[PDB]
Amino acid sequence: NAAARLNDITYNRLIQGLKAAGVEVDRKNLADIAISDPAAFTALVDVARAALPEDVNA
């Protein structure tokens, strides 16, 4: 959550996006990346942001 909010995105939307992309990555190693390599974390955020549909409608 801390890393995501530093990247201007919440946990909810982060995980939803990762699911839509198909990134079957755990939270353990995701957090390790979030610490030892924020850049790759942000890249994953951009992937998730791209993967999100549009809004709160369906």
Binding site: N1, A2, A3, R5, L6, D8, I9, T10, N12, R13, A31, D32, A34, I35, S36, P38
Partner: protein, 146 residues
Amino acid sequence: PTYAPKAGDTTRSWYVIDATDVVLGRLAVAAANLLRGKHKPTFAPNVDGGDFVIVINADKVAISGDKLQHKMVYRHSGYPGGLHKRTIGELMQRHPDRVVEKAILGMLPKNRLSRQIQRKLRVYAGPEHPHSAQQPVPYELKQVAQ
């Protein structure tokens, strides 16, 4: 595993909030999480991490008068009765810093770190902050996304 809880690996910077228009709730919450370090990926509840928070213009905290004249503060002594009942507005006229501080303490966890963190807080009623030798870092509030 974790790499944060390592002695010496804590950055304690000085953030400043010009808490005038801001409401009491949101103010205290932002100070609370920011002070404890929940904005950092290295948050570690076992240790006294986080950055220092400075509250400015505490006298101006946006509290509705409807509560200034109804919300009360209670300080029991230990003696029969001894309930030192006092109006929050009067506390704002005398020592508003105690008002804000109290509000934060009730938002922090009932533990010892409450005290180790509490000692990292500086609240001054006035606008001017004597401690400028360090680096003040003005902090602003927002709703992040969603």
